[PDB]
Design an enzyme around this catalytic site. Structure first.
Site, PDB file in Angstrom:
ATOM      1  N   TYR A 136      75.626  17.061  -4.656  1.00 52.89           N
ATOM      2  CA  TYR A 136      74.903  17.064  -3.390  1.00 52.89           C
ATOM      3  C   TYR A 136      74.105  18.365  -3.241  1.00 52.89           C
ATOM      4  O   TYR A 136      72.917  18.336  -2.899  1.00 52.89           O
ATOM      5  CB  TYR A 136      75.832  16.861  -2.190  1.00 52.89           C
ATOM      6  CG  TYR A 136      75.039  16.925  -0.910  1.00 52.89           C
ATOM      7  CD1 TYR A 136      74.230  15.855  -0.531  1.00 52.89           C
ATOM      8  CD2 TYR A 136      75.046  18.072  -0.124  1.00 52.89           C
ATOM      9  CE1 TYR A 136      73.479  15.906   0.624  1.00 52.89           C
ATOM     10  CE2 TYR A 136      74.286  18.147   1.034  1.00 52.89           C
ATOM     11  CZ  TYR A 136      73.508  17.056   1.395  1.00 52.89           C
ATOM     12  OH  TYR A 136      72.730  17.113   2.521  1.00 52.89           O
ATOM     13  N   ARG A 183      79.701  28.066   6.197  1.00 56.21           N
ATOM     14  CA  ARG A 183      79.402  28.712   7.471  1.00 56.21           C
ATOM     15  C   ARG A 183      79.244  27.682   8.592  1.00 56.21           C
ATOM     16  O   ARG A 183      79.602  27.932   9.744  1.00 56.21           O
ATOM     17  CB  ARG A 183      78.070  29.471   7.323  1.00 56.21           C
ATOM     18  CG  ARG A 183      77.682  30.292   8.553  1.00 56.21           C
ATOM     19  CD  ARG A 183      76.179  30.616   8.617  1.00 56.21           C
ATOM     20  NE  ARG A 183      75.333  29.427   8.466  1.00 56.21           N
ATOM     21  CZ  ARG A 183      74.173  29.399   7.813  1.00 56.21           C
ATOM     22  NH1 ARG A 183      73.671  30.499   7.259  1.00 56.21           N
ATOM     23  NH2 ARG A 183      73.506  28.257   7.707  1.00 56.21           N
ATOM     24  N   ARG A 193      78.260  15.365  11.074  1.00 55.24           N
ATOM     25  CA  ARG A 193      78.012  15.429   9.639  1.00 55.24           C
ATOM     26  C   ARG A 193      79.131  16.166   8.926  1.00 55.24           C
ATOM     27  O   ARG A 193      79.744  17.067   9.498  1.00 55.24           O
ATOM     28  CB  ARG A 193      76.631  16.011   9.341  1.00 55.24           C
ATOM     29  CG  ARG A 193      75.563  14.991   9.728  1.00 55.24           C
ATOM     30  CD  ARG A 193      74.157  15.329   9.253  1.00 55.24           C
ATOM     31  NE  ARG A 193      73.852  14.962   7.871  1.00 55.24           N
ATOM     32  CZ  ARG A 193      72.830  15.494   7.201  1.00 55.24           C
ATOM     33  NH1 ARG A 193      72.068  16.397   7.804  1.00 55.24           N
ATOM     34  NH2 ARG A 193      72.579  15.162   5.938  1.00 55.24           N
ATOM     35  N   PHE A 253      61.953  38.451  -3.128  1.00 53.47           N
ATOM     36  CA  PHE A 253      62.063  37.091  -2.615  1.00 53.47           C
ATOM     37  C   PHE A 253      63.370  36.412  -3.051  1.00 53.47           C
ATOM     38  O   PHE A 253      64.018  35.729  -2.233  1.00 53.47           O
ATOM     39  CB  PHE A 253      60.858  36.266  -3.087  1.00 53.47           C
ATOM     40  CG  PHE A 253      61.012  34.798  -2.835  1.00 53.47           C
ATOM     41  CD1 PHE A 253      60.661  34.256  -1.606  1.00 53.47           C
ATOM     42  CD2 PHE A 253      61.520  33.965  -3.822  1.00 53.47           C
ATOM     43  CE1 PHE A 253      60.812  32.894  -1.366  1.00 53.47           C
ATOM     44  CE2 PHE A 253      61.686  32.601  -3.592  1.00 53.47           C
ATOM     45  CZ  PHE A 253      61.323  32.068  -2.361  1.00 53.47           C
TER      46      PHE A 253
HETATM   47  C1  LIG Z   1      61.276  27.326  -0.664  1.00 54.23           C
HETATM   48  C2  LIG Z   1      62.092  28.171   0.318  1.00 54.23           C
HETATM   49  C3  LIG Z   1      61.857  29.675   0.344  1.00 54.23           C
HETATM   50  C4  LIG Z   1      63.031  27.621   1.186  1.00 54.23           C
HETATM   51  C5  LIG Z   1      63.381  26.281   1.301  1.00 54.23           C
HETATM   52  C6  LIG Z   1      64.161  25.993   2.588  1.00 54.23           C
HETATM   53  C7  LIG Z   1      63.549  24.815   3.355  1.00 54.23           C
HETATM   54  C8  LIG Z   1      62.388  25.103   4.308  1.00 54.23           C
HETATM   55  C9  LIG Z   1      64.024  23.510   3.230  1.00 54.23           C
HETATM   56  C10 LIG Z   1      65.021  23.012   2.392  1.00 54.23           C
HETATM   57  C11 LIG Z   1      66.149  22.274   3.132  1.00 54.23           C
HETATM   58  C12 LIG Z   1      67.258  21.856   2.149  1.00 54.23           C
HETATM   59  C13 LIG Z   1      67.070  20.474   1.514  1.00 54.23           C
HETATM   60  C14 LIG Z   1      68.318  22.673   1.723  1.00 54.23           C
HETATM   61  C15 LIG Z   1      68.803  24.048   2.251  1.00 54.23           C
HETATM   62  C16 LIG Z   1      67.725  25.000   2.780  1.00 54.23           C
HETATM   63  C17 LIG Z   1      68.089  25.293   4.239  1.00 54.23           C
HETATM   64  O1  LIG Z   1      68.096  24.002   4.845  1.00 54.23           O
HETATM   65  P1  LIG Z   1      69.124  23.667   6.052  1.00 54.23           P
HETATM   66  O2  LIG Z   1      68.461  22.805   7.053  1.00 54.23           O
HETATM   67  O3  LIG Z   1      69.529  25.089   6.670  1.00 54.23           O
HETATM   68  O4  LIG Z   1      70.453  23.072   5.351  1.00 54.23           O
HETATM   69  P2  LIG Z   1      71.143  21.672   5.769  1.00 54.23           P
HETATM   70  O5  LIG Z   1      70.148  20.652   6.189  1.00 54.23           O
HETATM   71  O6  LIG Z   1      72.003  21.196   4.500  1.00 54.23           O
HETATM   72  O7  LIG Z   1      72.181  21.994   6.960  1.00 54.23           O
HETATM   73  C18 LIG Z   1      68.592  25.434   1.595  1.00 54.23           C
HETATM   74  C19 LIG Z   1      69.644  26.511   1.904  1.00 54.23           C
HETATM   75  C20 LIG Z   1      67.877  25.570   0.226  1.00 54.23           C
HETATM   76  C21 LIG Z   1      67.980  26.994  -0.342  1.00 54.23           C
HETATM   77  C22 LIG Z   1      67.726  27.165  -1.709  1.00 54.23           C
HETATM   78  C23 LIG Z   1      66.865  28.111  -2.282  1.00 54.23           C
HETATM   79  C24 LIG Z   1      65.975  29.040  -1.447  1.00 54.23           C
HETATM   80  C25 LIG Z   1      66.716  28.223  -3.794  1.00 54.23           C
HETATM   81  C26 LIG Z   1      67.149  29.602  -4.313  1.00 54.23           C
HETATM   82  C27 LIG Z   1      66.931  29.697  -5.681  1.00 54.23           C
HETATM   83  C28 LIG Z   1      66.071  30.534  -6.393  1.00 54.23           C
HETATM   84  C29 LIG Z   1      65.147  31.533  -5.694  1.00 54.23           C
HETATM   85  C30 LIG Z   1      66.044  30.426  -7.928  1.00 54.23           C
HETATM   86 MN   LIG Z   2      73.608  23.779   7.607  1.00 53.89          MN
HETATM   87 MN   LIG Z   3      69.708  18.557   5.200  1.00 52.79          MN
END
Ligand SMILES: CC(C)=CCC/C(C)=C\CC/C(C)=C\[C@@H]1[C@@H](COP(=O)(O)OP(=O)(O)O)[C@]1(C)CC/C=C(\C)CCC=C(C)C
Ligand SMILES: [Mn+2]
Ligand SMILES: [Mn+2]
Ligand SMILES: [Mn+2]
Length: 334
Positions: A136, A183, A193, A253
């Protein structure tokens, strides 16, 4: 900047607050590419999260989302989520997506395609095993790390290895996501959820929601410590990944969110308050420390400090105590 690209940066500041600053500091072409990737991911997550959308309706949206990037007219007007604006004004985002160099478009669409397939798979099941937990997380976060890595390599600011070592990139994403899930126990329980893996929590209680009951706090904290201990296992990979980055803006970053997550896990470790809401992450200490932490030795020192904080709090009777000490000692010598 064009009005559409200005709007995109507006959306980035509203919807991805913790990442907006490090994104806007990225060198060259990476900046717009990563901005747009973040926004498309935000839109896709907003669909996935929306429990007012039936499974039947949701499945094709998640499957076909990658193709919407190429439909200039496509928007979605039925979201009740807080970030719905990115769906309602999707044409502005997909316009800027189609403005990116093809090499970036290809990575972004590929990840969106794969993420949507995976998100759809999990609409009809809970997370059972630790392996399912990893699966997941791969679909919602590991793939983001893989996508980001492929963007870095495509830009040529980083070596081919960064994009090619998908295991390390996957671990970076898994670490952030497991931290988020740990968290967010109570927020998630209240929104109906469940993300904690059943094969873990069912050794403590009969229903995941039982951890919110005061009488079960000790078992809840044991389970919490077990899951934290699982998440710490990604830190060797995070160190490996960060150690390879050549470009300063990319390093910042990548490093900043990982250190924030480490600080979050340290604050969550052995902390009853997880079960009553948001934990004071000592976000401030982490943010302040990272101002100066623009290199691997500085990053490592911060990691070790947080690990030492966890280590000296390990309860003797904790069922995971041996494992927690073991992974911390591995991290220390990497
Ligand atoms: C592209 C960028 C900066 C950010 C993208 C964040 C955005 C806007 C959307 C994505 C939403 C999804 C699908 C998953 C989670 C993001 C927060 O969502 P959230 O809603 O809080 O969680 P949930 O819905 O499960 O409660 C997450 C933590 C992905 C983090 C992973 C990273 C950053 C890769 C690091 C690796 C390297 C750097 C190799
Ligand atoms: Mn969350
Ligand atoms: Mn989600
Ligand atoms: Mn979300």
């Amino acid at each position: 900047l064009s009005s559409s690209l200005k709007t995109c940066y507006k959306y980035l500041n509203q919807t991805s607050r913790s990442f907006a600053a490090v994104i806007q500091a990225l060198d060259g072409e990476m900046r717009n590419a990563v901005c747009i990737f973040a926004l498309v991911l935000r839109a896709l997550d907003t669909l996935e999260d929306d429990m007012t959308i039936s499974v039947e309706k949701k499945v094709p949206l998640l499957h076909n989302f990658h193709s919407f990037l190429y439909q200039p007219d496509w928007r979605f007007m039925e979201s009740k989520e807080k970030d719905r604006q990115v769906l309602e004004d999707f044409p502005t985002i997909s316009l800027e997506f189609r403005n990116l160099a093809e090499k970036y478009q290809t990575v972004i669409a590929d990840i969106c395609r794969r993420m949507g397939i995976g998100m759809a798979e999990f609409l009809d099941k809970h997370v059972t095993s630790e392996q399912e937990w990893d699966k997941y997380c791969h679909y919602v976060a590991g793939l983001v790390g893989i996508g980001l890595s492929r963007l870095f390599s495509a830009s040529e600011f980083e070596d081919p290895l960064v994009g090619e070592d998908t295991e390390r990139a996957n671990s970076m994403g898994l670490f952030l996501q497991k931290t988020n899930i740990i968290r967010d126990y109570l927020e998630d329980q209240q929104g109906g959820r469940e993300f904690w893996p059943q094969e873990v929590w069912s050794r403590y209680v009969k229903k995941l929601g039982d951890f919110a009951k005061p009488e079960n706090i000790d078992l809840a904290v044991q389970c919490l410590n077990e899951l934290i201990t699982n998440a710490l296992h990604h830190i060797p990979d995070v160190i490996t990944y960060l150690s390879r980055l050549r470009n300063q803006s990319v390093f910042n970053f990548c490093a900043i969110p990982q250190v924030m997550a480490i600080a979050t896990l340290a604050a969550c470790y052995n902390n009853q308050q997880v079960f009553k809401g948001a934990v004071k992450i000592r976000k401030g200490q982490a943010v302040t420390l990272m101002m100066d932490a623009t290199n691997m030795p500085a990053v490592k020192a911060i990691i070790y400090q947080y690990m030492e904080e966890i280590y000296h709090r390990i309860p003797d009777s904790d069922p995971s105590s041996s494992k927690t000490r073991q992974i911390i000692s591995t991290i220390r010598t990497q």
